[PDB]
């Protein structure tokens, strides 16, 4: 079930058994790498890059063509973002909720949802600090987190 | 050219190298075989009277070998008539680390160096033109495991006659009995 909801949804991707490059796909691994570089330079997160490559260029899975994952490729080329995109989007959502709550002080539902969002933020940040992805002194403070956005 | 990793060439290895040099000098694919190389080769009985030629190839070249493996295997089968030919990448298995291993490991053994991964890759490469589409390990009452491999329907009758030498080669270099079959539902 969801971490912060009573939902028990099942909807997710189902990878095919075959791990090979599709026969239709004629892009070399380096071609996919350069397309990834271009999309990252455009200002896109790895999830967006994967979605675009799947929808338009027919790249069913970048890991199966290049032997590497999109975030690893971005890091190896040196153009990966400062903090992971899931944590970034969680902080962005928290910032939006706080901005809404500043001008709507009677919204208890917004306060409850903000509590849930910040709990998720803290859990993800602790995990990232454990993996040395974030500096050990990193902390999410709700005073200037809009700069992190 | 044959360059064994332990620099120990053999007479059969020499004959296979001579045949490959022959394809190197004049063939429709002479541009590729000049820069390519094989680590070893050997023959084995597979049951009855048929024979199989396992051509051991360095890993970095395997993909390139797989670019032209169909024509190469066709011509080498023609040169040897009734002995089937299979290209397998030369892969080493780093032993599972123990508490008593004197001096065999200084860095983490990669998962690609493990016995399970190496045997899976051997099974994948042994059947190259036909892609594996499923595996079933049936455990018999005596405890022995029989692997059933489902092969793609795009290339079935081109390698249907190969289902016999494939099991023989896998028994020879892996020790596991395996059956190869083709499913009706893709």
């Amino acid at each position: 079930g969801r971490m912060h909801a009573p939902g028990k949804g099942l909807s997710q991707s189902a990878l095919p058994y075959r791990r090979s490059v599709p026969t239709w796909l004629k892009l070399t691994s380096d071609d996919v790498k350069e397309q990834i570089y271009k999309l990252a330079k455009k200002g896109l997160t790895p999830s967006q890059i994967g979605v675009i490559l799947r929808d338009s260029h027919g790249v069913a899975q970048v890991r199966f063509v290049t032997g590497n994952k999109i975030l690893r490729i971005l890091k190896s080329k040196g153009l990966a973002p400062d903090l992971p995109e899931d944590l970034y989007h969680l902080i962005k959502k928290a910032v939006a909720v706080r901005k809404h709550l500043e001008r709507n002080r009677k919204d208890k539902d917004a306060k409850f949802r903000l509590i849930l969002i910040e709990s998720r933020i803290h859990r993800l940040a602790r995990y990232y600090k454990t993996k040395r992805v974030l500096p050990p002194n990193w902390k999410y403070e709700s005073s200037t987190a809009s700069a992190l956005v | 050219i044959v360059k064994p990793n332990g620099e120990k060439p053999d007479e059969f290895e020499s004959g296979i190298s001579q045949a490959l040099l022959e394809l190197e000098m004049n063939s429709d694919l002479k541009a590729q075989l000049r820069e390519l190389n094989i680590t070893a080769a050997k023959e084995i009985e597979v049951g009855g009277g048929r024979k199989a030629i396992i051509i051991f190839v360095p890993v970095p070249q395997l993909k390139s070998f797989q670019k032209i493996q169909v024509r190469l295997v066709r011509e080498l089968e023609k040169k040897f008539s009734g002995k089937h030919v299979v290209f397998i990448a030369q892969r080493r298995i780093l032993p599972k680390p123990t508490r008593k291993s004197r001096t065999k490991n200084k860095q983490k053994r990669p998962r690609s160096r493990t016995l399970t991964a190496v045997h899976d890759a051997i099974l994948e490469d042994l059947v190259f033109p036909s892609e594996i589409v499923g595996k079933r390990i049936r455990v018999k009452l005596d405890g022995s495991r029989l692997i059933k491999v489902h092969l793609d329907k795009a290339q079935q009758n081109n390698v249907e006659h190969k289902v016999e030498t494939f099991s023989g080669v896998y028994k020879k270099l892996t020790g596991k009995d395996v059956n190869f079959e083709f499913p009706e539902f893709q």
Binding site: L15, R19 | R136, I137, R138, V139, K140, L141, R145
Partner: protein, 129 residues
Amino acid sequence: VRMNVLADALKSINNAEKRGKRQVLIRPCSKVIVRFLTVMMKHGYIGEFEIIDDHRAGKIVVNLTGRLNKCGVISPRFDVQLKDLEKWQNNLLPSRQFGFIVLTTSAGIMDHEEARRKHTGGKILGFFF
């Protein structure tokens, strides 16, 4: 969330055998599940089983021959010495004539009689009879 995949597998086998079914599906598969199943099968309690290999975590289709009364797991995996084995047998097994306690020992996964033969102890995985 699910811990103890072996508990799930054993409960599934038990529930299927109590309904009189001929096969049971087990997911996910694991090495411990396969060894426990092999121990069960060597004593004629289940029969042949097939390991379906998907690229994430396999499944097992276990053929059931209705000779199984109860296959169960013991959580936590208590450490069992050769002295405590008799007390565990009295607690778990329905008779001294049949039934097996499965242990994981440094010599592998084996029933309690085989652990007495090799003069070894270990951790209790479960039981079947």
